[PDB]
Amino acid sequence: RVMYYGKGDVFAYRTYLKPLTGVRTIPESPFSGRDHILFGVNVKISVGGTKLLTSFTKGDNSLVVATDSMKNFIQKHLASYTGTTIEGFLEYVATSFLKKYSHIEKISLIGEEIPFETTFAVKNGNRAASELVFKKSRNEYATAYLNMVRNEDNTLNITEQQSGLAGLQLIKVSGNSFVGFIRDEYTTLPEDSNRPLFVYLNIKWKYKNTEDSFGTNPENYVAAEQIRDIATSVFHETETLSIQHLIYLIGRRILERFPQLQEVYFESQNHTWDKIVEEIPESEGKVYTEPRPPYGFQCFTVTQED
Template sequence: MFTMDDLNQMDTQTLTGTLGSIFEHSSWIAERSAALRPFSSLSDLHRKMTGIVKAADRETQLDLIKKHPRLGTKKTMSDDSVREQQNAGLSKLEQQEYEEFLMLNEHYYDRFGFPFILAVKGKTKQDIHQALLARLESERETEFQQALIEIYRIARFRLADIITEKGETQMKRTMSYGKGNVFAYRTFLKPLTGVKQIPESSFAGRSNTVVGVDVTCEIGGEAFLPSFTDGDNTLVVATDSMKNFIQRHLASYEGTTTEGFLHYVAHRFLDTYSHMDKITLTGEDIPFEAMPAYEEKELSTSRLVFRRSRNERSRSVLKAERSGNTITITEQYSEIMDLQLVKVSGNSFIGFIRDEYTTLPEDGNRPLFVYLNISWQYENTNDAYASDPARYVAAEQVRDLASTVFHELETPSIQNLIYHIGCRILARFPQLTDVSFQSQNHTWDTVVEEIPGSKGKVYTEPRPPYGFQHFTVTREEAEKEKQKAAEKCRSLKA
C-alpha cells in the first residue's frame, strides 16, 4: 500500500510504474498525471486521472476502451482484470455458460465496435449476464459513454486496492446522501430460537414466518465530492440502486434479526462499492402477530394469517466505516420506541420545590401515563447479531421488563422509575454496557374527581407542553444497586 506522500515524492518513472495498471494497458495516463501533482487525496488523484481521459480525443478514448478484455473470455489479460473476473466467478464458468458469454460478447462487439465493459467488483456472474443483455439494447453513443464511466469506476476500485489515506488530514464537512423508507418484507426467514429466558417475560423467540423492516441508508465518502461540486456522477450510486440492493439482500440474509441484517448489508455495501467510506443503516421492525385460527374443533394460532401490529416500534442502528481494507463498526445500538404504559395507582409526586411559580398540586396516589424510548448497547457488538442467540436481547424482553418494574414499584417519580427499569435490564443482561431512556409524562388531567359508589375517576388528555427526561443507566450503577438490594436483604434477615 502507498500513501499520498509516497506518490507525491516519486519520480515520474516510478509513479508511472506504480499507477500504470490502473487503466488497462494504458500507462500513459499515469505518466501524464505526474505533472498534476501534488495529489491531496485518493479522490483528487482519481479525479485528475479521469480528467486526462475526458480531455483526450475520441480516437484515444476508443483505443482505451478496446484495450479492455471481453468479460468471461479465457484470453490473456492484465493481472488486475484476471483477479477482478475471478472474484466475480467468471473464471469458473461452465462450458455452456462460457459459450453463452462468448456469443453475447461477440454480438456486443459486432453491434458497437468495442468490448462490453463493466466494473465487476461486488457483482455475480448472473448480475453481469443481465447487464450485458440489457445494454445490448442501447444506442452506440450511450454505450460509448457508459464504457468510459465503467472504466472510471474500475480505476477507482484499483486505486483503493493500492493506496491508503491513513494519516491524511481529511476535510471536515457534512457530506452524505441516501435513501429512506426502504420497505422490505420476507416470508420464512430463519426462526430466532435459543434466547435466554427471563422471569419477567414469556418471550421465547420469533417464528419469522413473516418479517418486515423499514430501512434508512446513508452513505458518505470523499469520492462523492465531485457530485456536489462539479455535478460529476461518475461514482454516484443511485438511491434507487440502494433500495434494490437492500431489498434483494434480504433474500440472501441467513440470520434471524434486524440487527444482524443491518450488519450484513453494511458489509456488503462497503465490499461492493470500495469508494464508500462510511455507512449508517437504521432498520425499524414492522411487526406481525399471528391471528387465532379455529382448526379441528379447537382454537389455535394460525401459521399462515398474521396482522400488522400497531403498538410500540423496535429499531436498530448501525454505523460502519472503512479504514484501508478494514471495515469497523463505529456504533451499534437497539431500541424500542413509543412504548406507552399507564399505571392507574401506586404513583406519587411530592416533595418538589414550591415557590411563586408552582401551580402543580402534590399527589400521593396518581395515575401515571409515560411514553418511553429505551435503547441498549452491547459490550461486544457481535452479540447484537444473534450468532449466539442466548446473548441476544430482544425488544420484547425489554418491553416486558419495563412493564414488570412499573407494576412492582411504588413510583415517586418518572426519573426514579426509568432508573430502576435500567438497573433491572442490566441485571438480567450483563452483556449490555448501558441502557438509555427518553421519557415523556403524558399523565391525564382529571375531569371528575369522585364518582359515587366507585373508586374511579374521569380523565382527559393532558394539554401540552409535556415534561420529559433523558437518562442513561450504566452497568456499574446496576451493580451498585444490586449490592444495595443484597445488603438490605441481609439486614432484614438479621
C-alpha cells in the first residue's frame, strides 16, 4: 500500500564546504570543480515503513518522527557533511537517517541545487572574481535523487539513484527546421525551414556504478555544469530537424563523453516564438513574439545500447 510522509522545501545553506576538485575537463566544458564558498540545497525528504500504519489508522504518534525533526536532521547533517557533492550529501543523510530510526524501511531524497554565480569586485585597484559576494541565480540548477531501503537482513541498499540538470532554457536563432510532418484535417502548422528553436531542458542521468555519483573519486563524477555545456554545444553544431532529433544527439554525446553512465533521460518543452516580420530592409534580422500558452513537450531516454 502507498504510505509515506516527510518534509519538503528544506532550504539549507552552507559556507565553506570541502571544494570539489579533480574533475577532468572535456572539450565542450571548462568545468574542473566547484569552490563551494557558498553551497545551497533545497531538500525534499520522504520516508516509508509498515510500522507507520497506526499513525494513520489510530492517531498513534509513538513511532512518528516529526517532519519538523526531519528538517532539523537534514540541516545538522549539512553542517557535519565532509563530502563534496549533493549526491554524496543525500547518501550521508539517508544512511544516517536509517541507522538512527530502525522502524523506517525506506527513505527517498531529492536535492535541488540553489545556484550562486560569481561577481566582479575591485581589490586595491584591480577587477577580479569576488570571494565574498555572490549573485543568486534563478536559471538552471543541478539536481539529485536517492532512494535507500532497509532489507529484511538489516543491511542498507541504494535501490535508485539519478542525478540531473533542471531549468535550462536555450534558444538557437537559426539553423533549425521542422518539416515533413503529417498534413491532414487537423494540421494548420506551416512547415518552417528556418526557425528560432526555443527549448526548455530537464536532463537526468543514471550511473552504471552508484559509487561514481558521490564524488569520492572525482575522475568518475559527471557534473551538471558539464552536461549543460554539452547541450549548448550540440544545439549549436546541429542542423536540428526537430526537438526529438536534438535530444537524441545531445544524449548520444553525453554517453560518449561519459562511458560511466548507463542512461540519459530527457524532458523537453517547445516554447518557440511566433514570427511577425520576415524581412527587414538591409539587415538579416527579424521580429518575433510570444506564442499562445500551449507548449510542445518530449520525453526520451538514451541508453549505451544505442
